[model samples]
Target: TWLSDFPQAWAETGGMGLAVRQAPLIIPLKATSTPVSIKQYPMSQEARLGIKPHIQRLLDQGILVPCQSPWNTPLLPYRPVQDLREVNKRVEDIHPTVPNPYNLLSGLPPSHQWYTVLDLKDAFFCLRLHPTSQPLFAFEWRDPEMGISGQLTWTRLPQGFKNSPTLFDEALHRDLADFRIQHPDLILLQYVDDLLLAATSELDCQQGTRALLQTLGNLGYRASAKKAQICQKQVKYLGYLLKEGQR
Candidate 1:
């Protein structure tokens, strides 16, 4: 109810005009290398059209902009594509801030009665990329039907970027600290976008989850309904099942 007035905190897709952080975030560029102009790989007509709506939404939200990049890779979901391989090679790697599992697990209660798992939907897109770093991710493509062709680059953080995981995790590591500090009953473990919240009872578990979702939306993160689960005595996390708090 409290978040109703702030509906712009979340969205169904892309940034979708959902008000989020206004601060521009920049990626550190070593030096200006010549921009890469990668050509778009050919796909089936159906595939191209299918991706149009997806691409158009990103464009509408300023998550992508028209550009012809020198670096490009074919699109597919079966296998990962290093669309920006050359660019990533040039860009410095940000060391991961991923929590040490051993240390993180050690602090959790040896057992639990209730749990909730929250997943951020397209979490990285919630954060905006600074204009200076946007052009480096640009690529070229064309669609005869849409009568559109040319260079396009990401205005938001894209998944394929080498530094994305590290950046997102690092950001959350700091942001979620306050949640933990405020609630001793809540045990929270986060890996980039996946969140596991644990408590000793159902009420605590529910309260923990509600507070978390509230904080996430307030801070510009949208929990994926399809991926999130709550009010459960048994829960699946990572690849393991936790029953009664024992893994």
Candidate 2:
């Protein structure tokens, strides 16, 4: 019945790998099987197609570290050896210490009104990395002689690094904190790439926007005017859908 989910040929040529792939194939509630036995050893595919060459290039250019274990390595040399599960596990847990800016609305006065959401264009791409810090990403894949230059070549942009988001978020947060400008009637909620500005009056909203725009510019980041919007009754912040009303 697993064949029903995929092309018919896969079921006909069933093996451990195929069986593993299709093992937990979706079953209708009534048709589900129970007491399935788990296999201790499972056969895995070990196909390496030009990955060696890519790793060699990276190594020769000194772009990444030459490492053996796929589990602990930041960048795995081989494909399939590292899956999403492994990669996600390697990411450093960064719990937000600040209060949930979205929850601030619950405490607002009944007269508090209006909100605006602003998205920074190319937030990460806009940040320029220090030249000395660039080469720290060097590594080898297949051979130690073949080093890879991890720098982005086409746009000469530094990107795709795992820690970029946290670095950017902290930088922006520190800048905002240093700004030390606050208004009783205004609230500013900031995610890494998105900013939510809320205020009670039109002038307050405009002032908040101007202050934020100035701060962004000072930090060498530009807010896209076309993508940024001002004053909406309902807006989404971070992952939550927000609505404005008497609290």
Task: Mark the regions of model 1 whose C-alpha exceeds 4 Å error after superposition.
Answer: 1-22, 30-34, 68-82, 100-106
**Which stretches of model 2 miss by more than 4 angstroms?**
1-111, 138-158, 180-184
Local distance difference test, candidate 1: 0.69
Please give, for residues 1-247, the per-residue lDDT of candidate 1 as tens digits: 4235334334443234322544556887557556555556776677666677777777787777876445554454222233667678677666666766655666668556688887777777766788787777776556786677676777777778888877887777667778889997678888777788988888888877778877777777776555667769888777678785675
- CA lDDT of every candidate: 0.69, 0.45
Model 2 / residue 121 / CA error / Å: 1.5
Superposition TM-score, candidate 1 onto the true structure: 0.82
Candidate 2 local accuracy as lDDT?
0.45
lDDT of 2 by residue, 113-211 (tens): 666776665455444444333323222223224443222211112245445566556656766675546554567666676777777777777676666
> Model 2, 103: alpha-carbon shift in Å?
6.1
